[PDB]
Each structure stands twice: as structure tokens, then as C-alpha cells.
Amino acid sequence: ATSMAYLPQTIVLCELRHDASEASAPLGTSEIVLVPKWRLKERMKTGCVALVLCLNITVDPPDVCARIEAWIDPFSMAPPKALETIGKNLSTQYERWQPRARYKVQLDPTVDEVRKLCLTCRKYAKTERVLFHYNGHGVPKPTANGEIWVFNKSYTQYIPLPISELDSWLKTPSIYVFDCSAARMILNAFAELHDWGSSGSSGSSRDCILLAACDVHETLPQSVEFPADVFTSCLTTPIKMALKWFCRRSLLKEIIDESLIDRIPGRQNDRKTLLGELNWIFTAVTDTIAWNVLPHELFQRLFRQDLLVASLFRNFLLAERIMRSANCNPISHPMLPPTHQHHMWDAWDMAAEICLSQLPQLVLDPSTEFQPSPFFTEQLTAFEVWLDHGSEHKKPPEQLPIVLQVLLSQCHRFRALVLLGRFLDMGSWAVDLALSVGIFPYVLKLLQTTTNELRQILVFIWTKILALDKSCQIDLVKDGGHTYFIRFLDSSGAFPEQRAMAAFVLAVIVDGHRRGQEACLEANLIGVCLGHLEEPLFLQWLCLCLGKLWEDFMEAQIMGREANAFEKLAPLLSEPQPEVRAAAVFALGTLLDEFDDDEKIRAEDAIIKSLLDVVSDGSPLVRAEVAVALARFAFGHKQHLKLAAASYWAVYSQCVRAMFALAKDPSPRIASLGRRVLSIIGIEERSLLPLSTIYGWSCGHFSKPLSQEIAAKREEKEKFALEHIAKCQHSSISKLNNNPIANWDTRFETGTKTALLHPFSPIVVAADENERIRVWNYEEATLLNGFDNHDFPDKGISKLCLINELDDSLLLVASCDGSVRIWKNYATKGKQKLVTGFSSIQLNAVVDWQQQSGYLYASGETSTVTLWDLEKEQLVRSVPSESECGVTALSASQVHGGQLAAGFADGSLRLYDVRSPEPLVCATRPHQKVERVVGLSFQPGLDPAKVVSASQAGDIQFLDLRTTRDTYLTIDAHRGSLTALAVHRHAPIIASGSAKQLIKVFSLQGEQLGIIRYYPSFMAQKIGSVSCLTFHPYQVLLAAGAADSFVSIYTHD
């Protein structure tokens, strides 16, 4: 219906730059600094490997059949040739994992031979890790005194080599494998070698890593399904061993020719061949278990640091499973939780079966009719299932390490990358998870992929990564990944939201990084950006990119001048979005750093002038930036600006005005910035300069993913309003009940100067003559809160208003100097933040808020009515009043957006339509005393008629301005000294106050509905400023307050 004029949908100052309780983020504060935990630079190398082999052949030791070793029958060859080949084979077997390392072998050695082997290996790989593989099958079991067994020259005795001496021969960076019976014995010994302490864990200190085959009591298998070399064949030949075990156990074995497993086609590298694809699934499977099973710290040490240790610990998880079947429990030193029968070996078993069937027909002919396994598709689908259902901090996704393996193959690259970004989007915790898995380098390498299929996903991934960890700068530049996004800025690939991301990603690459500045500068990133300057988030970020690109790097500063960046940036200082303007001020501010004119002076003058224009901006966000850019400028021109401060106490006298203006800004964070600028000049080494905040706040947009109860309490208030609009109009309003429903003591010494009844709750807001604010409840008889609107010495209250009444009210507090301060949560006992504060009028200020249009009209003893659009936080218009005397009163019509009424000092009255080219509609005298228009307002209704024109003379003149100039109706409320007027919003009712203690209420036709007489509490005889009268906006309640100390509420029974 028509009553949607009464019920405006505009909401204002409820954006992210105005944020509340647990974030002072909004601006002023610096950005939230992080401290990363995924940082181990030492990609360790195992440089030397020492294979020892104690197997006396046809000579069982006295602790006693399977006897295959390194997949060789040692009884097929004769003992010495047997042992040569096993020596070689087992080298080759390891060699495949770390082929860039030296392998030395020792066959049935002396303790001296093992000494030198170990001593030389330590001397070879100085800091690099040394691997000691030991095989004691043909010698006795390790002892409780901690002893390996070896030989003497003649092979007549078994000699015990004590573990202590090994540990002295090799040192810190080393890893041992023990394929023998009773292997724990060796680890229990190792643990006892050093003095306990030196860690905050189970029991460690050094970098000694240990892998043992079985427990203390246990003995390696004898069954012929296994070899003697089980643990080593798991650890070192995992695929071959994993399948041979699969045959002999699961499918019962005799159907499948087990010797096909030796002859599996292709190589371990080609993921397109059946062997390599099986090898790839195994790596993926194993790595995945380790990730889910372990913690961050241990996983990264074993599974990510050393290519060999990674492989040995991956392949160890297979030993965990195979050895378990043969009465053996293997243990590593970094102990690791139980791995066998994880829900993922199931996936391996399935992939192995599907492989092993196919192997039968692929031998019949090399058809290469090799169907890739579904495994990689299936798992990525399980990652999608996670991303919808349970998609929280409800334990990690498990498939994450498999998504990383997929990035290594074009086969599912796109859908992996897609699903990765989907995962990265849900917050920094997910980025932390991705980067823990080791996503960084593969996603970084992909920044050389020309495939435009990818790029829109890659920018989105790199946006999210850089949103968390700023520090990736260094890598991105070092591989030339900066070029990738500069292309994407210039690319014909549409969508400016994607380009803001591209501009942001570059902003971060550049941010305090001269290697990145220069490398982007060469790549024409100034030119790319300035080409686009000819959507708001994109504009915001084009400026922040450029701002960072010049900053303290004067080669770029020059390149920007001769590319006319001032000429292209400055037009953004007028844009409706504060976020753009503040970013534009940042860019121009960072372009900085007698009678002389060189190129730069022309620029640096033209800059500062265009910034000084924006000193009086309606957004703190902007003013904060202007004050910082002025501080920068001020640093370099102390000399001049001090001489400017001498004569005040060409362009330098402009600056000093603006400093002292900033110093007395309403928003105290802007104020304390202006006071900083003043101290840089010496009014009361770079480190003293305040620092821009706009970059830091904007970046928080990306670190954040890219409702119904909102509308619930919205419709609550609308229903109540519509119902109580009708009830105000259509009720036959009776006489005033002189019995008040309070006479509340404010404790204001001089008394109450203005008040404001709340629509949807039982609240009064009052105001002292020095702008203290109380929030008195009338239904509870209780205070809700107190205040001091601004600590400045010159006080004076002008206006109280509500803003966004229909969803969480914000209290506007206009000061008599034209300062306007808006408060959130004023109703709460202590918590109440200044949302925004600017200075309208640039005296006796008068102000009015028109929620319909979002306009704040303001004026006073000035030639002009100044208009503010609070959606933009911008001074939209200066209307000349055309009076040559002061605006005493100012009412904006709630129904008709743009239209404005104004009462004047000489008794005159004026309409304006502020949206018209000529804004003054008409100008009428009404009442004829030449005293000032104390109060006025539009008649409660849906027309441009007016109650208006209570003059201090005493007459309240009604008038309709569609028809005639003179007065519709006159009422003589008071013989002189009309101190206040209250007109209702919907109910046909008004009231007026006198300086003769007196209040009067009239029907809209003008019947004495009731008189009231505020009496004095002592004989001051100064109830001469009955200053506040104000109705409820949906009921017939009357609040009233004087030059005494009481705020009394009445009603109409």
C-alpha cells in the first residue's frame, strides 16, 4: 500500500567498514599479523648408504624353511656368487629410491670392516644423512646388552658389535634399518645410549631414526610364501612384494600365475603404464594413511623431508601390514600409531585386484588396452562428498593428500584444482591444511601452464594462499610467477572480480618487496593497471596494487608521473565507494618522496592539493588515509611547514590548516593521527610516521569465503508500525492525562536540552548541554547506559536521531559545531562504539536525518544548507538557502524524499526540493513578529502541508503550501518565549513549551488537549528552557525537559 513511504527499506552505515564488537578491524588498527608453522626449509638429503649383509650361507646360527633374499635363491648360485649378487641386487633395489647417493656394500664383515665402512660414510656425507641397512639372518639374534652380531676373518666365531660403537662411528643425521629377528633389542639399546632429557616427547634428542623388523621376543617368518628378506622387500621393493602377498593370501593363489608379477609391463615412472600407475596408487594410498594417522610435525619430518626417508616410511606402512600376518610387529623410532587395517588399504586391495586380473590379458599381447583405474576419480568424488556434508572443522577430509597426487597428472588436474579451491575457500584453516600436505610447489609450478582452462582456478587458489601467508612473495617472484597474473590482468578472459583477485595477488607480491617491485615494474604493471583506469572492488585493488608498486621505490614513482597516473587516479577521489577513494588516496600518497620547478614539484603540488580536497571527506576510512599521506608529505617538507606554522600561529599554508583540522576531527582515531602529523612538524626517525591501514583491511576480504532472521525482526517492526500508524490516525485522541509516567532525575546540573523516545522499545535517550548521553528506561524505571559524546572542551548539543529504526537503531548525535557522531549499541550498559563521525558544515548547527533518501541535511548560521549522502559518506550538495540570516530550524519530510523545510532567524520559512536544479521551492513569511523559528515540521500525513512555525513569538501557524501562502490555521500557544515545539509523526496532535514553565497540547485542528506546568524544585525561577518536547513515533506519549534536571513522560489515558 501507500504506507511504504512510512516504511523505508534503505539501510545505512551497516557495512563492513563500520564493524563492531570483537573487531576494531574497521580501520585505524593495523592488520592481523600471522606466525606460520609449515616451515622446514631443510629438504634433507641421504647422501650415503651402507648396506651390511651378515648371512653365512648353509650355516644356520644356533637360534633355529624360507631363504630367498633380495629376490635371489642363494642356494642356486653357490655361496660366494650368491652373496655377490644379493649385495648388488639389494643395492639396486634401494638405489631406485635415492639414485643420487653413494651405496657401499659389506658382505659377511669383520667389526673392523664395519668400523671403516661407517667411518667413511660419515666422512662422505658430512651433514647429509647416512643410511645403515643391516641384515643379520646368518648370525645370532641381537642381545639385551644391545649388540649386533658380525664375524671374525676365519668365519669361525660370531663377534658381537656393540650398538654404542656404531652410534659413535655414524652420527647425528642418520637412519638405520634392521632386518633381523628380535630387532627391538637394538632400538631399546639405542634409546639407552644417551642421557634422558633433551626433548619434550616420549624419548628422543638427536636425529637418529630407526626401523626394526619385529618385536623383542619375535622371530622373522619361516613359511615359504615369504622370503627371509620380508621387511627389506616391503621397505625396498614394495609393489612386487605387495602383490605376491596379495596372491598367496587373498584370492587363494593358484588361479593367477604369480610369475606375471615379475613381468608387469612398463616402468614405475609412466603413470600411463600399468606398473607405474600401480606404483602411483600405492604412493597415494600410503601417503594418505600417514597423513591422517600422524600429527603435522612428525608427518612432515618422515614423509616430506628426505626423499629416501619418505619412501622408507611409506614402504614401512606396507611392512606394518605384511609382517603382522607372519607373527611380527615392526617399529620405527619416531614410533607412529597403528597403520594396518586403515580404511584405505581396502582401496589399495581393490586397485590391486583390478590390476592383477588385467595383467593376464596384457601379457597375451602388448595391446596396451590398459584402462586407467577409477581410484583417482573415486577418491576425488569422496572429497566432494566431504565438501558438502560435515564440511566444518569436523576432522580433516582424508582425500587431501590424494588431490595433491592428482595435480601431478593432467588426467584429473582441472577437477582436482577446482575441488582444491572449493576446499581452500572455506577458510585459512583449510589453506593451513593444504600447505601442510605440501600443495605449495605443485601449484607454484603450474604458474608456467599456458592452458586457459586452468588459469581462472589458479588465480583463485593463489588468491586464497596469499590471503593467509603474505610471505610467498619470495617464491612467486623467484620462479617468475608474477608474470602469470599480469597476463591475467590484460587477458581477454572476462569477469572483473577475477581481475581484482589478480590485482590483489600482485599487490601482495609487491608489498614491501623490492625484488618483486622491480620484477613487476619491468613487466609493465604500471601500464597494465593504468589501462584499466579508463567495477568497484577492481578499482579499489587497481589503486592498492599501484600504491604498493610505487611505495618508497622512486624509479616506479617516476614511471608513474610520465605515465600520467595522477591524471587517472585523482578522478577516483570522487567515487561513491569510500573503499575506492581511500585506496585512491593511498596510491597518490605513496607517489610522494625556495622557487624551483622540476617535473616532480608540479606533480607533488598537484597531488597534495587533490588530497587536501578530501581532508573533509565524510568517511573516517578516507580521512585516515589523507592524514597518513599528509604525514608522508610533511616529513619531506618540515622546513616549509614550520615557517607556515610561524605566521599562522603557497601550498604549505593549505597543509597546516588541514593538520589542525585533522587534529580536531570528531573520529578520535583520525584526531590522534592529525596530532601525530603536528608533532612531525614540531607543534606541541621515519619510524615516527603513521602507517596506512586501507591495504591491510581490504586484504581481509579474500581471507573469507567467496540471512533469514534478518527479515524476521524487520517484518516484526513493520507490522507493529503499520498497525500503530493506523491507530494513531484513526483513534479519537482524548485529553492529556496530567498524571505523568515519570519525573526522572538525569543529574544534569544545567538540565536536559534534547530527548528522543524510541519506537519499538521502552527507552528514552536524553542529552546534557555538554553532550553527556543517558538511556533511561521508563517501563523499568532504570538506566540502560551513560556517555560522554566527545572529550573536547567546547561542548554543545544540537540533535538526537535514530538511524535504521527498522533494524537495530544507531543514535546520531549532532554537536552545535556541526560534528555528527553515530553510535552503535547505545542501549547496552557499557559497550557502545562510535560507528562514524564526520563534520557537516565546512554557529549553532541544526541537523535532520531523512531515512528515505539516506540524506543528512545540515546547516545553521551559514548561507548554505549542506547535504550529505550517508550511503556514500559524501557531501552531495551545497544548496544556498537564500535568506541572509540563520537557519534556526530544519525538518526533513519522512514521506517525501529530497523535500526539506527550514525555519529562519528572521521568522521566515522555506521549502527546498534538494533534488531539483533550482532547490528553493517557495519562501513564505507566516507569523509576523520578526522573532526566530524555534521549531517546525511537516504535518503528520502523506502531503506537503506543514504544522511548522512555532515562532519564539508564541504563535504556532499551520499552512498548506500547495494552495496558498498565508496560514491555514493560527494558534496562540504562548505570550512570547516559545522555547520548543513537538509535532507528532502520525497522530493528529502537537505540543508546545514555554519559558514560563509551561507546556500545552493541541489537536491538529487546534483544541487545548491539555496543559502541563513543570514547577521548579528550588527558587531559581528558571524553568525558562523547556527545551525538549518530543512525541513517541507510534503512540501518544509525551517526553518533556527543562533548564532544571528532570525528564517527565505523560500519556492520554
Partner: peptide
């Protein structure tokens, strides 16, 4: 930045 190979 390594450990697992990528095809290029």
C-alpha cells in the same frame, strides 16, 4: 619444492 615428480 619437490619430493613427488610432476610431468613436464
Amino acid at each position: 619444492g619437490g619430493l613427488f615428480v610432476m610431468d613436464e
